[PDB]
Amino acid sequence: QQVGIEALSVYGGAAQLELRKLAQARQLDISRFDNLMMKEKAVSLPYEDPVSYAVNAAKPIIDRLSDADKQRIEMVITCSESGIDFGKSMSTYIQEYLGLSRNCRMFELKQACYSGTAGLQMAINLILSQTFPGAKALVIATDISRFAEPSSGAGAVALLVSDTPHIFQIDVGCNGYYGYEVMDTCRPNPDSEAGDADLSLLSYLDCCENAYRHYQNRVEGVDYRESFDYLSFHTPFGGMVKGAHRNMMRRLKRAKPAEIEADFQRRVMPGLVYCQQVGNIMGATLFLSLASTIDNGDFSTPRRIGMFSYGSGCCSEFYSGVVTPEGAAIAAQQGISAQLADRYSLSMEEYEQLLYHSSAVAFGTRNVTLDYQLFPGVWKKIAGKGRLVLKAIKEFHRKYEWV
Amino acid sequence: QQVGIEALSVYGGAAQLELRKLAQARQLDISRFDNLMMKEKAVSLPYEDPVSYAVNAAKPIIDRLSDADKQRIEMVITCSESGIDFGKSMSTYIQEYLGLSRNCRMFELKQACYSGTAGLQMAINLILSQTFPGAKALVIATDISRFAEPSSGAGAVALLVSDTPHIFQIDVGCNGYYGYEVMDTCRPNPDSEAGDADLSLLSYLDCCENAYRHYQNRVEGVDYRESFDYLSFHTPFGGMVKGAHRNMMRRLKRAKPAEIEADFQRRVMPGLVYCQQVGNIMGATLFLSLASTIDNGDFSTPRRIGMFSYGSGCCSEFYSGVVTPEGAAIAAQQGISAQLADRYSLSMEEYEQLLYHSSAVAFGTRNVTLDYQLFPGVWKKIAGKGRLVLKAIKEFHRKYEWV
């Protein structure tokens, strides 16, 4: 039976910071961010939050659907570690502002950066259950980093999941997973994060190897080089993905350094292009890598892509699917590259004021009325584009506006 | 194909407060809590949290399984609105202390009191997907109310979900759902809650009617009186369920008050017995109602039970399944009634000190070392029973102990 991603759209912020500017101002060496493969990060404005990010990611998917097809969306799963309430899912606001049916299951899913993949797998199982033939699911991974600093971005990726997978056809039952309790990173307080970078790295590699091994036990004769034309990873920053791929290749194939580096460039580097322009966007990062792989790699014949998802805490999953030339052409028409190039480029001064202004929309805020003209220049880049923004919070009720 | 609940276990706290004591001390009329059908609420100790609640609910399920069957659990979903971190699911700690396989998907699911049902439905779809024949799922709804006051309890219910549904066989595809964005209640701050009781009531009734209507459109010829031998509801407090059932009967059947009251006693009252001894335990309340219905109703021949789930914010679902005499006998052996009767009964003085002591384990706590002898009497009721408790938090890492 067939199942997968019918459509994929991305929102990479309205603004970004070139990390060279951060380095220079923060008295670090410029070869640092270069060595880690970080170029830019998306930055959220105070009149934006995970809801507005998610709706803007999803809006193009919904714009294209017939009314009948729009009404077939019967599940909305929001995947996030930047929640705004202890009980209320963001899915309720998303439903409201996209105009979806009231006959719709709505909830939010949490397991650090694994959340997106977990949501995708639940959606896949809805279609495969055949409980409601024709039903689609909308899965949106959305996260903002509202203050590690240099790698922490903002973005969202929306996936429409159905039995006509125009973009990514899932290899059904081809899944391995692995997790265990570990304090690599966590978010025990609002608008905050705690963790050990060295333990983060160890756990990511341990899961990368063991999740793949589980997949291997389930998919007989699979080969780490030959069965996958490209690889996409959860990408905290590019340097770390390069390390993990190097480790996999050394162990699984006894490959030599030069061979490993050529394989990295061919199979992995295409996925990192967009990741370097947004930074780590948590549960949405793997899906952005997929989108990047599709736009930047070669799809003149169908290709298989291996997917590795990881979330601190920890849990992980390795899985796969296929993209055709048709799929790649549809994906190219979304214009991700151009979207990312048109974002406003922040000066260091603007960026520090942005940080200072972010306290007003902290977790738990009861009332706030946003000033859209905080940065008039950023506003020029938004007005008229049909973007959702956060207008206000009144007695904890969030109100949003199309601008 | 077959699917449902293979096993069900409950944890209803180590202590409780008789609400008559609260009334009297709080200068209210005693007919108040009587009129609302509230008798007792479970109360959480400071050395207990949602993790310890969940593990204690799940421990008997796991104790009974062969090693092979234990290893077949490949998904753990924790359903809660009392989370302890913004990214780390409680499922990781639960996995650790029950000893489950590392080849296991782990995440937490949020949509106020709808969370449990959403988790159950995802588990059902895992089995029905047939992606991994033989796989089971463990779904645990767990919540504590750590300070409306009189109705707010603490408890957890654990469900093992598989293709051998010894306890509750699900009617596959018999589902209606309904939700929309509404500010009836929400939890915008830690260890806190905001909401309007009158808007809460309106939304619950609106969803009760529309979720059922959706089920009706999908299940031809179904009848609200005749097709369901019992009804279980999300139960904020019994009076409200009585109101909702009255409303459904009036509208769907033109039934008269005396007929309605007899039907309430026959089909609904059995589900409320255990609910009145624990209070509102959020996402776990419907599953406790199911357990109560099973133990207190008549299962000498198989019976169909209609299930209504609601979560503020809001979303809801109506669904159904069947319990056989065999299932009911297995459920009786769990001894829920006796478990609930053996809890320590708090005086009003002990209860106010408990509230005062709860600040030490608030959301965001980085370090704390618990004094188990806070109430020596409560401890007598726990020591030696194989209960998990929270021992400490050290740099946000929670440590638990079997006692």
PDB file of C-alpha atoms in Angstrom, chain A residues 64-322:
ATOM      1  CA  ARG A  64      -3.685  24.503  -3.187  1.00  0.00           C
ATOM      2  CA  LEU A  65      -6.302  22.007  -1.964  1.00  0.00           C
ATOM      3  CA  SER A  66      -9.823  21.705  -3.339  1.00  0.00           C
ATOM      4  CA  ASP A  67     -12.532  22.247  -0.724  1.00  0.00           C
ATOM      5  CA  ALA A  68     -13.222  18.512  -0.721  1.00  0.00           C
ATOM      6  CA  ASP A  69      -9.546  17.711  -0.082  1.00  0.00           C
ATOM      7  CA  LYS A  70      -9.247  20.350   2.610  1.00  0.00           C
ATOM      8  CA  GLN A  71     -12.189  18.710   4.391  1.00  0.00           C
ATOM      9  CA  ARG A  72     -10.407  15.357   4.270  1.00  0.00           C
ATOM     10  CA  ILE A  73      -7.783  16.555   6.770  1.00  0.00           C
ATOM     11  CA  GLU A  74      -8.972  14.723   9.915  1.00  0.00           C
ATOM     12  CA  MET A  75      -5.832  14.947  12.045  1.00  0.00           C
ATOM     13  CA  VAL A  76      -3.580  17.859  12.952  1.00  0.00           C
ATOM     14  CA  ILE A  77      -0.445  17.022  14.921  1.00  0.00           C
ATOM     15  CA  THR A  78       1.787  19.853  16.085  1.00  0.00           C
ATOM     16  CA  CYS A  79       5.345  18.738  16.937  1.00  0.00           C
ATOM     17  CA  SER A  80       7.251  21.059  19.158  1.00  0.00           C
ATOM     18  CA  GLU A  81       9.359  21.713  22.193  1.00  0.00           C
ATOM     19  CA  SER A  82       8.344  25.452  22.290  1.00  0.00           C
ATOM     20  CA  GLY A  83       4.822  24.976  23.625  1.00  0.00           C
ATOM     21  CA  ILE A  84       2.702  27.846  24.907  1.00  0.00           C
ATOM     22  CA  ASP A  85       0.495  26.008  27.427  1.00  0.00           C
ATOM     23  CA  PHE A  86       0.630  22.941  29.681  1.00  0.00           C
ATOM     24  CA  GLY A  87      -2.616  21.475  28.258  1.00  0.00           C
ATOM     25  CA  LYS A  88      -3.822  23.411  25.214  1.00  0.00           C
ATOM     26  CA  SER A  89      -2.246  22.204  21.969  1.00  0.00           C
ATOM     27  CA  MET A  90      -1.222  24.658  19.356  1.00  0.00           C
ATOM     28  CA  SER A  91      -3.173  22.535  16.927  1.00  0.00           C
ATOM     29  CA  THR A  92      -6.430  24.298  17.962  1.00  0.00           C
ATOM     30  CA  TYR A  93      -5.129  27.736  16.829  1.00  0.00           C
ATOM     31  CA  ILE A  94      -3.716  26.221  13.671  1.00  0.00           C
ATOM     32  CA  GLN A  95      -7.047  24.658  12.812  1.00  0.00           C
ATOM     33  CA  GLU A  96      -8.792  28.002  13.408  1.00  0.00           C
ATOM     34  CA  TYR A  97      -6.528  30.148  11.214  1.00  0.00           C
ATOM     35  CA  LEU A  98      -6.254  27.700   8.327  1.00  0.00           C
ATOM     36  CA  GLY A  99     -10.019  27.098   8.348  1.00  0.00           C
ATOM     37  CA  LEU A 100      -9.956  23.296   8.725  1.00  0.00           C
ATOM     38  CA  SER A 101     -12.913  21.044   9.530  1.00  0.00           C
ATOM     39  CA  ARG A 102     -14.215  20.762  13.083  1.00  0.00           C
ATOM     40  CA  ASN A 103     -14.295  16.976  12.546  1.00  0.00           C
ATOM     41  CA  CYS A 104     -10.594  16.742  13.247  1.00  0.00           C
ATOM     42  CA  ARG A 105      -8.400  15.155  15.920  1.00  0.00           C
ATOM     43  CA  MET A 106      -6.026  17.780  17.345  1.00  0.00           C
ATOM     44  CA  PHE A 107      -3.012  17.357  19.666  1.00  0.00           C
ATOM     45  CA  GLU A 108       0.612  18.243  20.235  1.00  0.00           C
ATOM     46  CA  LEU A 109       3.518  15.850  20.490  1.00  0.00           C
ATOM     47  CA  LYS A 110       6.736  16.261  22.477  1.00  0.00           C
ATOM     48  CA  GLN A 111      10.133  14.358  22.550  1.00  0.00           C
ATOM     49  CA  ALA A 112      12.666  17.064  21.894  1.00  0.00           C
ATOM     50  CA  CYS A 113      13.830  16.979  18.194  1.00  0.00           C
ATOM     51  CA  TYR A 114      12.314  13.568  17.596  1.00  0.00           C
ATOM     52  CA  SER A 115       8.800  15.104  17.796  1.00  0.00           C
ATOM     53  CA  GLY A 116       8.420  15.669  14.022  1.00  0.00           C
ATOM     54  CA  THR A 117       9.268  12.107  13.036  1.00  0.00           C
ATOM     55  CA  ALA A 118       6.993  10.729  15.728  1.00  0.00           C
ATOM     56  CA  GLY A 119       4.164  12.863  14.342  1.00  0.00           C
ATOM     57  CA  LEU A 120       4.927  11.732  10.777  1.00  0.00           C
ATOM     58  CA  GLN A 121       4.879   8.086  11.835  1.00  0.00           C
ATOM     59  CA  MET A 122       1.528   8.478  13.610  1.00  0.00           C
ATOM     60  CA  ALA A 123       0.131  10.059  10.412  1.00  0.00           C
ATOM     61  CA  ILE A 124       1.490   7.265   8.286  1.00  0.00           C
ATOM     62  CA  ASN A 125      -0.194   4.741  10.566  1.00  0.00           C
ATOM     63  CA  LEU A 126      -3.516   6.573  10.277  1.00  0.00           C
ATOM     64  CA  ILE A 127      -3.497   6.122   6.477  1.00  0.00           C
ATOM     65  CA  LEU A 128      -2.223   2.511   6.755  1.00  0.00           C
ATOM     66  CA  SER A 129      -4.782   1.591   9.402  1.00  0.00           C
ATOM     67  CA  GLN A 130      -7.468   2.116   6.728  1.00  0.00           C
ATOM     68  CA  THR A 131      -9.889   3.155   9.467  1.00  0.00           C
ATOM     69  CA  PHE A 132     -10.995   6.137   7.301  1.00  0.00           C
ATOM     70  CA  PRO A 133     -10.020   5.738   3.641  1.00  0.00           C
ATOM     71  CA  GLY A 134      -9.440   9.134   2.015  1.00  0.00           C
ATOM     72  CA  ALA A 135      -8.419  10.809   5.303  1.00  0.00           C
ATOM     73  CA  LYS A 136      -5.339  12.994   5.251  1.00  0.00           C
ATOM     74  CA  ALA A 137      -3.217  14.264   8.123  1.00  0.00           C
ATOM     75  CA  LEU A 138      -1.416  17.554   8.577  1.00  0.00           C
ATOM     76  CA  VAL A 139       1.817  17.278  10.610  1.00  0.00           C
ATOM     77  CA  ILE A 140       3.608  20.497  11.500  1.00  0.00           C
ATOM     78  CA  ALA A 141       6.959  20.707  13.275  1.00  0.00           C
ATOM     79  CA  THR A 142       7.514  24.168  14.649  1.00  0.00           C
ATOM     80  CA  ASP A 143      10.062  25.601  17.056  1.00  0.00           C
ATOM     81  CA  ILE A 144      11.595  28.953  18.005  1.00  0.00           C
ATOM     82  CA  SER A 145      14.601  29.592  20.220  1.00  0.00           C
ATOM     83  CA  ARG A 146      13.518  32.552  22.400  1.00  0.00           C
ATOM     84  CA  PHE A 147      16.380  33.525  24.742  1.00  0.00           C
ATOM     85  CA  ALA A 148      23.969  27.219  21.745  1.00  0.00           C
ATOM     86  CA  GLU A 149      22.969  30.802  20.987  1.00  0.00           C
ATOM     87  CA  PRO A 150      24.703  30.665  17.567  1.00  0.00           C
ATOM     88  CA  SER A 151      23.204  27.319  16.505  1.00  0.00           C
ATOM     89  CA  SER A 152      19.637  27.974  17.713  1.00  0.00           C
ATOM     90  CA  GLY A 153      17.190  28.945  14.960  1.00  0.00           C
ATOM     91  CA  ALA A 154      13.481  29.315  14.298  1.00  0.00           C
ATOM     92  CA  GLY A 155      11.410  27.596  11.644  1.00  0.00           C
ATOM     93  CA  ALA A 156       8.604  25.263  10.776  1.00  0.00           C
ATOM     94  CA  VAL A 157       7.900  22.591   8.209  1.00  0.00           C
ATOM     95  CA  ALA A 158       4.419  21.370   7.335  1.00  0.00           C
ATOM     96  CA  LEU A 159       3.692  17.933   5.919  1.00  0.00           C
ATOM     97  CA  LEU A 160       0.466  16.762   4.333  1.00  0.00           C
ATOM     98  CA  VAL A 161       0.336  12.984   4.706  1.00  0.00           C
ATOM     99  CA  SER A 162      -1.933  10.771   2.566  1.00  0.00           C
ATOM    100  CA  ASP A 163      -2.216   7.724   0.302  1.00  0.00           C
ATOM    101  CA  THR A 164      -1.066   9.786  -2.709  1.00  0.00           C
ATOM    102  CA  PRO A 165       2.488  10.641  -1.713  1.00  0.00           C
ATOM    103  CA  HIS A 166       3.458  13.063  -4.527  1.00  0.00           C
ATOM    104  CA  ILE A 167       6.622  14.169  -2.714  1.00  0.00           C
ATOM    105  CA  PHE A 168       8.030  11.338  -0.596  1.00  0.00           C
ATOM    106  CA  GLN A 169       6.843   7.763  -0.866  1.00  0.00           C
ATOM    107  CA  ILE A 170       7.529   5.960   2.415  1.00  0.00           C
ATOM    108  CA  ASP A 171       9.184   2.544   2.549  1.00  0.00           C
ATOM    109  CA  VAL A 172       6.508   0.863   4.698  1.00  0.00           C
ATOM    110  CA  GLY A 173       7.764  -1.097   7.739  1.00  0.00           C
ATOM    111  CA  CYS A 174      11.365   0.013   7.057  1.00  0.00           C
ATOM    112  CA  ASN A 175      11.997   1.505  10.486  1.00  0.00           C
ATOM    113  CA  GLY A 176      14.527   1.154  13.284  1.00  0.00           C
ATOM    114  CA  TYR A 177      14.345   3.028  16.569  1.00  0.00           C
ATOM    115  CA  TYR A 178      16.396   3.388  19.698  1.00  0.00           C
ATOM    116  CA  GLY A 179      16.262   5.400  22.915  1.00  0.00           C
ATOM    117  CA  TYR A 180      17.014   5.385  26.624  1.00  0.00           C
ATOM    118  CA  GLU A 181      16.971   7.908  29.474  1.00  0.00           C
ATOM    119  CA  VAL A 182      19.967  10.284  29.324  1.00  0.00           C
ATOM    120  CA  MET A 183      20.530  13.918  30.409  1.00  0.00           C
ATOM    121  CA  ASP A 184      22.224  15.106  27.211  1.00  0.00           C
ATOM    122  CA  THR A 185      19.992  18.173  26.890  1.00  0.00           C
ATOM    123  CA  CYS A 186      16.625  19.168  28.370  1.00  0.00           C
ATOM    124  CA  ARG A 187      14.369  22.262  28.831  1.00  0.00           C
ATOM    125  CA  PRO A 188      13.374  22.216  32.485  1.00  0.00           C
ATOM    126  CA  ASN A 189      12.417  25.934  32.500  1.00  0.00           C
ATOM    127  CA  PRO A 190      10.470  28.190  30.042  1.00  0.00           C
ATOM    128  CA  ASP A 191      12.413  30.020  27.262  1.00  0.00           C
ATOM    129  CA  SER A 192      15.568  28.202  28.382  1.00  0.00           C
ATOM    130  CA  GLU A 193      17.769  25.087  27.828  1.00  0.00           C
ATOM    131  CA  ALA A 194      20.245  22.949  29.852  1.00  0.00           C
ATOM    132  CA  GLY A 195      22.691  20.283  28.602  1.00  0.00           C
ATOM    133  CA  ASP A 196      26.190  18.937  28.062  1.00  0.00           C
ATOM    134  CA  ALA A 197      27.532  19.261  24.496  1.00  0.00           C
ATOM    135  CA  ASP A 198      29.932  16.283  24.894  1.00  0.00           C
ATOM    136  CA  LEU A 199      27.191  13.973  26.241  1.00  0.00           C
ATOM    137  CA  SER A 200      24.864  15.296  23.467  1.00  0.00           C
ATOM    138  CA  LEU A 201      27.419  14.174  20.894  1.00  0.00           C
ATOM    139  CA  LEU A 202      27.965  10.713  22.413  1.00  0.00           C
ATOM    140  CA  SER A 203      24.238  10.001  22.568  1.00  0.00           C
ATOM    141  CA  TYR A 204      23.565  11.178  19.022  1.00  0.00           C
ATOM    142  CA  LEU A 205      26.262   8.768  17.670  1.00  0.00           C
ATOM    143  CA  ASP A 206      25.130   5.909  19.844  1.00  0.00           C
ATOM    144  CA  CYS A 207      21.568   6.351  18.520  1.00  0.00           C
ATOM    145  CA  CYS A 208      22.695   6.884  14.926  1.00  0.00           C
ATOM    146  CA  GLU A 209      24.422   3.515  15.026  1.00  0.00           C
ATOM    147  CA  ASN A 210      21.767   1.562  16.955  1.00  0.00           C
ATOM    148  CA  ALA A 211      18.701   2.910  15.201  1.00  0.00           C
ATOM    149  CA  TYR A 212      20.345   1.986  11.898  1.00  0.00           C
ATOM    150  CA  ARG A 213      21.254  -1.470  13.190  1.00  0.00           C
ATOM    151  CA  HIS A 214      17.561  -2.059  14.076  1.00  0.00           C
ATOM    152  CA  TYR A 215      16.513  -0.996  10.586  1.00  0.00           C
ATOM    153  CA  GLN A 216      19.155  -3.361   9.172  1.00  0.00           C
ATOM    154  CA  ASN A 217      17.764  -6.315  11.155  1.00  0.00           C
ATOM    155  CA  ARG A 218      14.370  -5.528   9.656  1.00  0.00           C
ATOM    156  CA  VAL A 219      15.400  -4.811   6.060  1.00  0.00           C
ATOM    157  CA  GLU A 220      17.464  -7.727   4.865  1.00  0.00           C
ATOM    158  CA  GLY A 221      20.522  -7.064   2.716  1.00  0.00           C
ATOM    159  CA  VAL A 222      20.407  -3.296   3.114  1.00  0.00           C
ATOM    160  CA  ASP A 223      23.717  -1.489   2.572  1.00  0.00           C
ATOM    161  CA  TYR A 224      24.721   1.849   4.116  1.00  0.00           C
ATOM    162  CA  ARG A 225      26.447   3.119   0.959  1.00  0.00           C
ATOM    163  CA  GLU A 226      24.573   1.339  -1.837  1.00  0.00           C
ATOM    164  CA  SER A 227      20.915   1.359  -0.712  1.00  0.00           C
ATOM    165  CA  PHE A 228      20.732   5.139  -0.070  1.00  0.00           C
ATOM    166  CA  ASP A 229      21.332   7.741  -2.793  1.00  0.00           C
ATOM    167  CA  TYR A 230      21.161  10.511  -0.168  1.00  0.00           C
ATOM    168  CA  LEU A 231      21.130  10.817   3.591  1.00  0.00           C
ATOM    169  CA  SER A 232      19.258  13.371   5.696  1.00  0.00           C
ATOM    170  CA  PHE A 233      19.913  13.855   9.411  1.00  0.00           C
ATOM    171  CA  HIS A 234      18.665  15.840  12.323  1.00  0.00           C
ATOM    172  CA  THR A 235      21.211  18.643  12.039  1.00  0.00           C
ATOM    173  CA  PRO A 236      22.104  20.564  15.203  1.00  0.00           C
ATOM    174  CA  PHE A 237      24.875  22.059  13.023  1.00  0.00           C
ATOM    175  CA  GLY A 238      26.602  20.638   9.931  1.00  0.00           C
ATOM    176  CA  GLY A 239      29.969  19.723  11.537  1.00  0.00           C
ATOM    177  CA  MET A 240      28.260  17.236  13.774  1.00  0.00           C
ATOM    178  CA  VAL A 241      26.440  15.521  10.900  1.00  0.00           C
ATOM    179  CA  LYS A 242      29.790  15.279   9.109  1.00  0.00           C
ATOM    180  CA  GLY A 243      31.258  13.623  12.235  1.00  0.00           C
ATOM    181  CA  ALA A 244      28.370  11.151  12.478  1.00  0.00           C
ATOM    182  CA  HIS A 245      28.493  10.208   8.816  1.00  0.00           C
ATOM    183  CA  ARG A 246      32.265   9.771   9.125  1.00  0.00           C
ATOM    184  CA  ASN A 247      31.735   7.456  12.091  1.00  0.00           C
ATOM    185  CA  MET A 248      29.072   5.380  10.339  1.00  0.00           C
ATOM    186  CA  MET A 249      31.194   4.955   7.248  1.00  0.00           C
ATOM    187  CA  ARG A 250      34.325   3.987   9.179  1.00  0.00           C
ATOM    188  CA  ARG A 251      32.493   1.367  11.216  1.00  0.00           C
ATOM    189  CA  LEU A 252      30.074  -0.038   8.640  1.00  0.00           C
ATOM    190  CA  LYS A 253      32.318   0.028   5.569  1.00  0.00           C
ATOM    191  CA  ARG A 254      35.964   0.346   6.717  1.00  0.00           C
ATOM    192  CA  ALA A 255      36.106   3.347   4.399  1.00  0.00           C
ATOM    193  CA  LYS A 256      39.186   5.553   4.165  1.00  0.00           C
ATOM    194  CA  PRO A 257      39.211   9.274   4.878  1.00  0.00           C
ATOM    195  CA  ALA A 258      39.253  10.472   1.249  1.00  0.00           C
ATOM    196  CA  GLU A 259      36.463   8.087   0.223  1.00  0.00           C
ATOM    197  CA  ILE A 260      34.459   9.164   3.266  1.00  0.00           C
ATOM    198  CA  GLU A 261      34.807  12.855   2.381  1.00  0.00           C
ATOM    199  CA  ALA A 262      33.706  12.300  -1.253  1.00  0.00           C
ATOM    200  CA  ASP A 263      30.676  10.327  -0.005  1.00  0.00           C
ATOM    201  CA  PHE A 264      29.845  13.149   2.444  1.00  0.00           C
ATOM    202  CA  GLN A 265      29.865  15.682  -0.365  1.00  0.00           C
ATOM    203  CA  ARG A 266      27.775  13.534  -2.674  1.00  0.00           C
ATOM    204  CA  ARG A 267      25.134  12.103  -0.298  1.00  0.00           C
ATOM    205  CA  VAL A 268      24.966  14.426   2.724  1.00  0.00           C
ATOM    206  CA  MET A 269      25.973  17.926   1.716  1.00  0.00           C
ATOM    207  CA  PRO A 270      22.858  18.523  -0.349  1.00  0.00           C
ATOM    208  CA  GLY A 271      20.692  18.146   2.801  1.00  0.00           C
ATOM    209  CA  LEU A 272      22.754  20.753   4.689  1.00  0.00           C
ATOM    210  CA  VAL A 273      22.312  23.674   2.292  1.00  0.00           C
ATOM    211  CA  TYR A 274      19.043  25.013   3.800  1.00  0.00           C
ATOM    212  CA  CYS A 275      20.013  23.928   7.338  1.00  0.00           C
ATOM    213  CA  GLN A 276      22.955  26.361   7.205  1.00  0.00           C
ATOM    214  CA  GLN A 277      20.605  29.227   6.495  1.00  0.00           C
ATOM    215  CA  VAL A 278      18.178  28.638   9.358  1.00  0.00           C
ATOM    216  CA  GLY A 279      20.262  27.002  12.137  1.00  0.00           C
ATOM    217  CA  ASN A 280      18.895  24.239  14.398  1.00  0.00           C
ATOM    218  CA  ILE A 281      15.071  24.369  14.235  1.00  0.00           C
ATOM    219  CA  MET A 282      14.598  21.353  16.487  1.00  0.00           C
ATOM    220  CA  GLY A 283      11.962  18.841  15.482  1.00  0.00           C
ATOM    221  CA  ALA A 284      11.611  20.469  12.063  1.00  0.00           C
ATOM    222  CA  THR A 285      15.313  20.207  11.116  1.00  0.00           C
ATOM    223  CA  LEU A 286      15.200  16.714   9.558  1.00  0.00           C
ATOM    224  CA  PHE A 287      12.226  17.689   7.380  1.00  0.00           C
ATOM    225  CA  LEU A 288      14.057  20.836   6.252  1.00  0.00           C
ATOM    226  CA  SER A 289      17.069  18.604   5.446  1.00  0.00           C
ATOM    227  CA  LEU A 290      14.766  16.398   3.359  1.00  0.00           C
ATOM    228  CA  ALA A 291      13.526  19.465   1.445  1.00  0.00           C
ATOM    229  CA  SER A 292      17.134  20.602   0.971  1.00  0.00           C
ATOM    230  CA  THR A 293      18.221  17.184  -0.225  1.00  0.00           C
ATOM    231  CA  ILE A 294      15.390  17.166  -2.758  1.00  0.00           C
ATOM    232  CA  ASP A 295      16.073  20.658  -4.201  1.00  0.00           C
ATOM    233  CA  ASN A 296      19.884  20.335  -4.236  1.00  0.00           C
ATOM    234  CA  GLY A 297      20.490  16.732  -5.240  1.00  0.00           C
ATOM    235  CA  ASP A 298      19.966  14.817  -8.480  1.00  0.00           C
ATOM    236  CA  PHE A 299      16.499  13.375  -9.163  1.00  0.00           C
ATOM    237  CA  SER A 300      16.572  12.666 -12.913  1.00  0.00           C
ATOM    238  CA  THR A 301      15.708   9.060 -11.924  1.00  0.00           C
ATOM    239  CA  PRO A 302      13.872   8.034  -8.678  1.00  0.00           C
ATOM    240  CA  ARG A 303      16.115   8.052  -5.581  1.00  0.00           C
ATOM    241  CA  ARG A 304      16.077   6.515  -2.134  1.00  0.00           C
ATOM    242  CA  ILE A 305      16.755   8.731   0.869  1.00  0.00           C
ATOM    243  CA  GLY A 306      17.737   7.460   4.311  1.00  0.00           C
ATOM    244  CA  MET A 307      16.400   9.535   7.212  1.00  0.00           C
ATOM    245  CA  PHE A 308      17.886   9.727  10.735  1.00  0.00           C
ATOM    246  CA  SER A 309      15.894  11.438  13.466  1.00  0.00           C
ATOM    247  CA  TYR A 310      17.170  12.162  16.978  1.00  0.00           C
ATOM    248  CA  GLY A 311      15.806  13.901  20.003  1.00  0.00           C
ATOM    249  CA  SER A 312      17.659  14.543  23.239  1.00  0.00           C
ATOM    250  CA  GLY A 313      16.506  12.743  26.313  1.00  0.00           C
ATOM    251  CA  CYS A 314      16.635  10.535  24.245  1.00  0.00           C
ATOM    252  CA  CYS A 315      14.921   8.716  21.291  1.00  0.00           C
ATOM    253  CA  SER A 316      15.723   8.210  17.625  1.00  0.00           C
ATOM    254  CA  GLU A 317      14.574   6.544  14.416  1.00  0.00           C
ATOM    255  CA  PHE A 318      16.080   5.595  11.070  1.00  0.00           C
ATOM    256  CA  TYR A 319      13.728   5.218   8.115  1.00  0.00           C
ATOM    257  CA  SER A 320      13.536   5.762   4.353  1.00  0.00           C
ATOM    258  CA  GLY A 321      11.564   6.628   1.243  1.00  0.00           C
ATOM    259  CA  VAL A 322      11.715   7.506  -2.449  1.00  0.00           C
TER     260      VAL A 322
END
